[PDB]
Symmetry: T
Subunit: 167 residues, 12 copies
């Protein structure tokens, strides 16, 4: 059972666009948690490379927040109701957070970031599958661009770790 | 017992700058919750004036996130450890959130925003008191600018409601 | 019989891309009329909110004219011939115009704008159906972005009226 | 009987500023038709020089639309009611349109453009005469700048045709 | 006896360009008072719409101060001596000021602004009459642009009040 | 009896922040008069150096008007009511104005400017004393920046006169 | 046997995304050759129109190099290995090059450019077919935008030659 | 016999717009000579104030060259033929030039500049008279703006000399 | 006897840097005449291509005027005295001017421009020879950049004529 | 005996603001030496990370030079006389310099930078103490911002070294 | 036999500027290959530092392509014919390429880049020698700037490797 | 014995580019001292003209610091080791500094600045001689541009003093 299959089953468990609204709302929660995690790296990182990795985190954060704006506004537009409290984000996100600590290595931060973007790219694939199923071309394009951007991020972060993208 | 006295007692309940670190960390949690609340207004608002109030929320959000950056980075700099998970923000913030609903009136959203900024200005006053007490001039200036900005926001939001600032 | 079905039947009534050229040309006529209608609101509106709604009309107008440029140029590119006289626009558009009057209320102008964008989003859906049918991926993307943009406009205009998007 | 005399008689045929309002409204209709004609050249032109003449048409179009904004807004301001439907523009304009065809030569397009600007400069002269007559200095300045700009356009378009301005 | 006739008689009551210098100097005083009045609206306004009307006042203020610069510098240039103390502005202006109060309604502020611009447009008409009389083409153009701008402001402010321009 | 002592006694002669509101309001009046005086130099100056001193006056004017905005808005925010008529500014300001004359020397204009900024720096010192007394940290910072800026201006204007700052 | 069928057979002749990687790599080689060909026109062209066609070549070159960046980076991201030597580009490209000569006419250069973009649009169609087949939505969007852009270029270059797009 | 009367007689000495074309052509010659004279000041000046007067000359030069562009292009547009050789400029200009010398004082350069702008303002007045006479509103506006600009320059240059404008 | 030899003999015919000052001064005169000639093309040109060649002339003019600034200022700097009257430019320039006429063909204008730049490049070569001879490295670099720029202009203008550079 | 106590004793060893002037002058000398030291790192560094650390040094240098400008100008303004020769900077600075060598490691350069900023932050604390003592609010704010900025720099440089700020 | 001597012998092996044209053409081929090699590093690099070295490659690439433009255009201008096919670049370049592989270390990529720039700086020295020999000052300046830029690149890349420039 | 001969003898007193490295290093020391001297003028100047001469000093300072960057980086690049401590600059510079005093006249400051730039231009001439001798074309160009810039500065500063350049 792949991650994509697990996400799909979970999103669609509980109108003609109910699954699309559900996957968008899952993305509201996951993007909010992902942003928090990236912010934690920005704050807690120590080690050689800090001076270029620290501002890189701010760029990733801005990009995640732009995804959140587009996802939430698309959800409102198609007749849904986005999660909009920190407790909802935390409860419904499939991403876990841990207490910040300065003793995490640069390598650990980079590994966690890759796990986050791998998760997001899988969520977006489920988004693609659902929007094709329900015939929402606009939301399909949103998930396409978000997946493409995530995959590029994985390539570059993996390269910094000395690895290939391994999608 | 004033709000300022209540915040002070709560912040200092549990080095030479322990109270300053605690009030900065309280601000990390409160700013993160305040941003979430403002975002909720941006998404859920309906009614005449939406077309200027909606982008106003994005400006307030950007300003709150800039406060968060400065507060968290100041806390790291003076030897502290900022809250950095959504669960920590939600648990330690003194601001409550409610589930988003489209049936809240414009007037209700404006009233909630004023309550949020009144709370923040009081927190910043406690920040002023603590930093004077512990002799942290840099952090005192941070809380001064944040309080001044909050008070200006209260004046303008109150004026939109047809009221005076009533600090 | 839905609006989408009615538009489709009308567009395809009278090469391998004849239906795509026809729906693009329908959009040339409808966008030209829509721009005229928006301009009428810009000129004739009176009432509280004028000072933000008036420039909003100029933004909508610019956006409609940008759609017209892209639609007409795509039509030329794929071997068609765009309508290019005011009489052709008026005759072939499915949007009606009325003589300007200063006695229309702000609420009436907002209602008319929503009707216009609802119509356009339906036309774009027909555009999606036709381009999928004829295998024109480039023109399909054009109609996707135009529909997404129209749906966002409907959400925001509806919110100003105190309503949900009701797509 | 000159073109200027013919335009004057026609404009004034059917308050202290009735003739000024009529000539401004004639300009609303003529500018809307002129813009349509210029757009037709932008779309249908084929032949050597396309790559600089095509963007030139977009510049002329922007300039005509700016004239329309200023004329319509001046008309509203002085107590009039601008034409605001495509049928009104087409019916009241003294400029004729023809169905677009790709078989028109570059030379034919340039000749038509010169005829359009010659017509507009004559309309503006009537505008000058009427506003002097009725003592509207503000509207007189508007027609002065519009005539000056039209005359410059005629010089440059004529030069491209190998001719003098021949005003 | 019209407002224009009253202003003319008053301006010319007490070289070849004495009347032109007098009307320019009247404008120095009136623009300085008008700016003060607009600033009062910026500060004292309360009520729905504040968030767009408040910055609108800053735009009007900047525009009035730009008129003042051009009028005063033109007066110096043609051999005059502009009023240059607050007491002179207050004494010679035909605009009255009242003590600021927060209890004025938005509608009252908009009504006062329209009265101010109506007065200014009449002053500028007298400026036109005087400069035509004395053959000062440069100063005539200054008053023409100022009148045109004032008339546009009246249209837009009147529209916000739900009214026509009623020049 | 120093100028600072005289200003303090006068400001506080006639809630927990009454003295702060009074000194801010004194600054509203003085800044409005100072701006008028600077404008007079801009207009009436003749002599070598005009071509750099004339635009310098516009820079000083812009800076004084920015102080006025910040002072007036701070006063509104903390629950006060700023002077907002030319008669109030003139009556309550401690700065005197004189009728403009072209026969004042460059040296006289520079001397007057230095007197104005010396006065303002003393007013700001009283502002510092009062805000420390009443515990208004935000308003204290406003007066600090204004005093610092005034003192810099005095240094530079004094240097142009061939003198030291002599604060 | 169409050009599209020939390209497909050739690309797929020698994981779940092998055909997508192959068509992207074909595009690496073809874009590198296309850029070289365009550069040759920039350098060797002589004749009337040079002064606008010469900079047009630099715009086309920049656009081709931007396609190359996006194609190569997408190929790396999805687990491939882009051609990255001039010998590989030359060997695997289906575009032929000829030695530069100043004796080629403007018309010959324009004809060659159209052949190049026709070839590229066909390659992109194969890219569309392959990515639909293998379910790569991100790469499908890349080929869609590239095809749309190529088709627009063909329209404009054809128009300069006095011809229709003839896709 | 005033300078204006002398210029008029000279310009009109040797169609319905012959006098307008003649005065525009006189301005071509005079502006070309004026620019040369200003350039001479830029190069040859020595003395205190050089560091601000030297760049001032470049600003005046740019402004004179912009007048030349507008005058020459207006002349072409209305059916004339501008002087276009240095010998024609020198022969027909009413401004004399002298060999450059470093021994001219700053005061001498400023005096010469004022004479040049006084001459130009008189030429522009003749331009006003002629264009009113021949009914060329567009060219009348050109001369109005040029005269206004010249008069402002005279005020500022005179002020630098310690004098009033003395138009 | 080459053009370079003829220019050298003429420049040096009538301190340690006398020849350098003479060749710079020759360039003052020639650049002033060249600018006049280019301006004549800008004004008098008629024929296909006008719309791109006309603004090209303004670019060439700006570039020639920038050369003039650098040459004249270098001449002043090294102890010389630049020509600074139109009569001096005309008398000492080796470039001839002819009365403007609208009947010159585009081809004739392009041929004349090439002759002008060929002349200038030869003058600059003499400048190179003289500055090498007299050991002025700074002035040598000035002539190097000017020659390089002239040679580029010749290539591009020649290409527009359908020719090679033929330096 | 802390570093702060040692700096204070040394600064105050040899009017009402003598200690403030002395500590500002100490900062003139120390900032000039600090800038020199940072420049040495910019030039002499070798090792992995050079390509981001090298430009980082230019940013630090610009920031130090901006501190120097503000400190020196504040000192002049309050009646002092800044050190203004390299010998004075070197003699009075408490920072030592060493001859540049390419054999210093990246880690050594980072350690030295941290020592420099630690020293500066202590100097600024003494500046805070002295300005509080002498009642100079303006200079106190200058030292506050400088200390805050230094402390931020220490956090970031320490993080690059893999360490906490350890203020 | 030095690299410079070997390049010279090879370039000049097979008019008055034949050697200059040959060395420029050698540079066309070498710059095209160098750009390809740099692009390969951009694509294939993996390892710590990727996130700053990857964009560094794009900067180097842009700079190499700017050299190519200037070299090729200079060659055309002086009467030559630049290589303009990928096969010509590959055949005539003295730089070898290897198939891209992800297994090359960061250190290997940096070493290869240094070899490339060392080669280019030697080629440019030959360019200097040849242009001095043939008296082409313009082309000599081109090679001077290119060599200087290459030498700077070698210093910075060497520093990243922990080495001195070792030219 | 000229200044140039004295500088040469001194620089070369104590590889194939030893003299070039020595003269560059002399320039490191002299530019650092020159910047200090210019900064002293910026701070200590009093007298008429301060308001334009003070910012002029900041422009000169920026330009000197840009020379220092280019000289030091060139020295590193060609295998040298730049002076990098204030004591080295002071010891090896041939420019003397004096204690700052407010009693120096504007004329004295201008005279000192001219002496500094005269010295620098002579140093640069020695730089030219040495780099020609050792065959360093890149460093020769650096000294050429620096000398040219210095000579321009001398012309302009001398003109402000009422003098010719007297190089």
């Amino acid at each position: 059972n792949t991650l994509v299959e697990n996400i799909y089953a979970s999103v669609t468990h509980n109108s003609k666009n109910e699954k699309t609204k559900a996957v968008l709302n899952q993305a509201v929660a996951d993007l909010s948690v992902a942003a928090s995690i990236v912010h934690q790296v920005h704050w807690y990182m120590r080690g050689p490379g800090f001076l270029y990795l620290h501002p890189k985190m701010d760029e990733l954060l801005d990009s995640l927040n732009a995804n959140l704006d587009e996802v939430s506004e698309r959800l409102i537009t198609i007749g849904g109701a986005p999660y909009s409290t920190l407790a909802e984000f935390s409860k419904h996100s499939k991403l876990d957070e841990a207490k910040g600590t300065y003793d995490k290595t640069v390598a650990q931060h980079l590994a966690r970031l890759v796990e986050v973007y791998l998760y997001l790219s899988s969520l977006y694939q489920v988004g693609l599958d659902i929007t094709d199923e329900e015939g929402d071309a606009g939301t399909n394009d949103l998930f396409t661009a978000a997946k493409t951007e995530a995959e590029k991020t994985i390539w570059m972060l993996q390269a910094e770790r000395g690895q290939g993208p391994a999608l």
